[PDB]
Design a protein around this nucleic acid. Structure first.
Ligand SMILES: *O[C@H]1[C@@H](O)[C@H](n2cnc3c(=O)[nH]c(N)nc32)O[C@@H]1COP(=O)(O)OP(=O)(O)OP(=O)(O)O
Ligand SMILES: [Zn+2]
Length: 635
RNA sequence: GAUCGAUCGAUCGAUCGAUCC
């Protein structure tokens, strides 16, 4: 039921101006949006109709908003619908927009329509409600819609422009250090959304924090393990592996010049990636031994990266989980190739496993971080035996490691697997939320806490400055509410004018396409895949090959997670068709009725014909060549 | 295919996670 708390938030928006209203709850925002929609559709006299649009960022929240708006708007006779990726396939979105009032289509669909030509002007709507409007920062679909709105407004042909009332929970600080930078960031966010009012609770503070999270911070600084026997063995393995890898690459220490790297860190992973990308561009004129050298170097770098990931897992999660990860990687990589390099690496890993398994089964090598985690979990479940806990981790490789640790450790039997009846839920990013644990990560049931287990004071300082940023953001919101609506309007107008100017400035013209007929080669094999003359672009995003020689140059493999995205339908993945390469080259899809193995320029190296330099790109946008459109009349 | 956030490294690059088409 609409109470005074919702009316205080909805009042500054019913006048007819955009707002940056922010509520710490979700049901409050939903109810406020409902009342705003009602007051906007009921204020229009006879002869006019409303076209309020709601922008949901995710599919679950989209379905929730669609259900709520369909259940609420049943006695008013309003056409409420919604479009998504599984709905805008061969459907007249223009007829849906023109024959409905409360459409809840996604922002990406509206951006694609504005780019294609459908819905030319943004003045057809009369009310825009951007859910979670704090994402309007850079290159966002919300930001693209706002750029279109500003281009239509400041361009001099602004017609019946709709309201741009937003809806978020936290305004956000970003990277602000002092109050002035926070105020500048908030003003830039408000000008990007083109709003002069920031509605928030200022009078009804009595009933605000009744259903508010209100968390508690319980930072616990822990130290790492000292008995790094497993780490020592893995470091010796990586050391002799890098030593025997320099037999073919004498300049391996000069390909990446950053600093002295240590095993078990992210800097070592970056060094591995850099030396891999630097050795993948070898130009030996033999073209037969170069392939073997590149394959051996790729195998060496992949094994080193897997060892580094195992070291990171053993440092963060348990040791047996890292050993199981290594064994699983070696089992999955053994059935692929049987060459001398892989056989030597596998036999060395098997020789070291006889001691690795003995070190892993030693009960005196338990991580103290997991020890204090188990201790605090036990004390929290002894305080209350009905706590639904959530455990955030950095990398997904720990979501199963901690799950196996919970299932195996006998000191905690009240827990249940919660990989994302379920007691603890081990996830990575985002119910009851009775307790949150940030294990090296940087709601309801009032009385919840938030533990921060970390072996570094850097995360503690980051959380402290984040709390300070939240406080100064609240202060800046208060200061902006103190200001008037006129000077704020002039300020946001100047800010958005400068934004439009700098945006029109950074407009790179069409680059000269490389008329040469360069070719593409595999990453870990350096085999001739296809020339650029046989590469056809479909919709300025996807690239495919239609040659007949390339059709037998790959092998198919069943896709573990197939899904269609508005243009194709997945069928399988494509891999390199060589002796023991099995490298990912792309994915097999169907556009309308044919079958196309669309490849990615990331897993390829570009070699010229005239010069011969082996270039390496990451995205198709960086590859500047003659992009011939895919014509279905050929094949 | 694009976007976002975090970490790291030389205005850019790598990894991770999430989102959409
Ligand atoms: O070039 C990309 C891209 O064209 C295509 N692709 C795969 N999924 C999508 C999608 O959801 N939406 C769009 N627009 N394009 C998609 O795959 C090419 C790259 O192949 P990848 O193996 O890297 O991607 P894939 O989905 O096959 O596997 P993964 O990256 O998720 O692990
Ligand atoms: Zn290959």
């Amino acid at each position: 039921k609409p109470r005074n708390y919702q009316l205080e938030l909805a009042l500054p928006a019913m006048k007819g101006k955009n707002t940056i209203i922010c509520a710490p709850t979700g049901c409050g925002k939903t109810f406020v949006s409902l009342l705003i929609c009602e007051h906007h559709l009921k204020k229009f006299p006879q002869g006019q109709k409303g076209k309020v649009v709601f922008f949901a960022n995710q599919i679950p929240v989209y379905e929730q908003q669609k259900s709520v708006f369909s259940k609420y708007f049943e006695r008013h006779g309003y056409r409420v619908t919604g479009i998504s990726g599984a709905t805008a396939e061969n459907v007249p979105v223009e007829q849906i927009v023109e024959n409905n009032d409360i459409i809840i289509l996604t922002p990406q669909i509206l951006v694609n329509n504005l780019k294609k030509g459908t819905i030319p002007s943004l003045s057809i709507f009369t009310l825009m409600i951007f859910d979670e409007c704090h994402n309007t920062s850079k290159q966002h679909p919300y930001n693209m819609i706002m750029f279109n709105y500003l281009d239509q407004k400041l361009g001099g042909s602004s017609g019946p422009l709709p309201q741009v009332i937003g809806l978020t929970a936290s305004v956000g600080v970003g990277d602000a250090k002092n109050t002035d930078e926070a105020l500048d960031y908030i003003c830039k966010l408000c000008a990007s959304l083109d709003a002069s009012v920031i509605a928030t609770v200022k009078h009804n503070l009595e009933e605000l924090e009744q259903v508010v999270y209100k968390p508690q911070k319980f930072f616990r600084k822990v130290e790492s393990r000292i008995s790094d026997k497993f780490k020592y063995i893995i470091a010796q393995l990586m050391r002799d592996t890098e030593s025997l890898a320099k037999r073919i690459c004498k300049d391996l220490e000069n390909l990446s010049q950053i600093q002295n790297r240590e095993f078990g860190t992210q800097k070592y992973e970056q060094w591995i990636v850099t030396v891999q990308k630097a050795c993948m561009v070898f130009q030996m004129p033999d073209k037969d031994e170069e392939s073997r050298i590149c394959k051996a170097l790729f195998l060496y770098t992949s094994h080193l990266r897997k060892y580094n990931d195992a070291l990171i897992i053993s440092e963060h999660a348990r040791m047996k989980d890292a050993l199981d990860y290594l064994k699983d990687f070696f089992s999955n990589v053994r059935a692929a190739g049987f060459d001398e390099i892989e056989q030597d690496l596998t036999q060395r890993f098997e020789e070291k496993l006889q001691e690795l398994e003995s070190v892993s089964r030693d009960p005196s090598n338990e991580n103290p971080k997991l020890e204090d985690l188990c201790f605090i979990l036990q004390e929290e479940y002894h305080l209350n035996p009905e706590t639904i806990t959530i455990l955030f981790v950095k990398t997904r490789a720990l979501v199963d490691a901690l799950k196996n640790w919970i299932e195996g450790n006998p000191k905690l039997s009240f827990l249940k697997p919660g990989i994302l009846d379920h007691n603890i839920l081990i996830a990575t990013s985002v119910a009851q939320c009775n307790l949150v644990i940030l294990y090296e990560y940087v709601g309801r049931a009032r009385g919840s806490k938030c533990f921060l287990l970390t072996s570094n004071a850097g995360v503690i300082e980051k959380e402290q400055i984040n709390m300070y940023k939240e406080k100064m953001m609240n202060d800046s919101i208060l200061r902006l509410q103190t200001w008037d609506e006129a000077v704020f309007r002039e300020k946001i107008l100047h800010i958005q004018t400068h934004e439009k100017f700098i945006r029109d400035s950074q407009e790179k013209p069409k680059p000269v396409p490389d008329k040469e007929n360069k070719k593409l080669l595999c990453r870990k094999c350096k085999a001739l895949a296809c020339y650029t003359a046989d590469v056809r672009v479909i919709e300025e995003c996807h690239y495919t090959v239609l040659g007949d020689a390339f059709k037998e140059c790959f092998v198919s493999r069943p896709h573990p997670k197939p899904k269609q995205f508005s243009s194709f339908e997945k069928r399988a993945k494509i891999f390199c068709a060589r002796q023991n390469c099995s490298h990912d080259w792309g994915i097999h899809v169907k556009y309308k009725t044919f079958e196309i193995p669309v490849i990615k320029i990331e897993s390829f190296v570009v070699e010229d014909i005239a010069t011969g330099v082996q270039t390496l790109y990451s995205k198709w946008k960086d590859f500047h060549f003659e992009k011939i459109p895919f014509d279905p009349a050929e094949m």
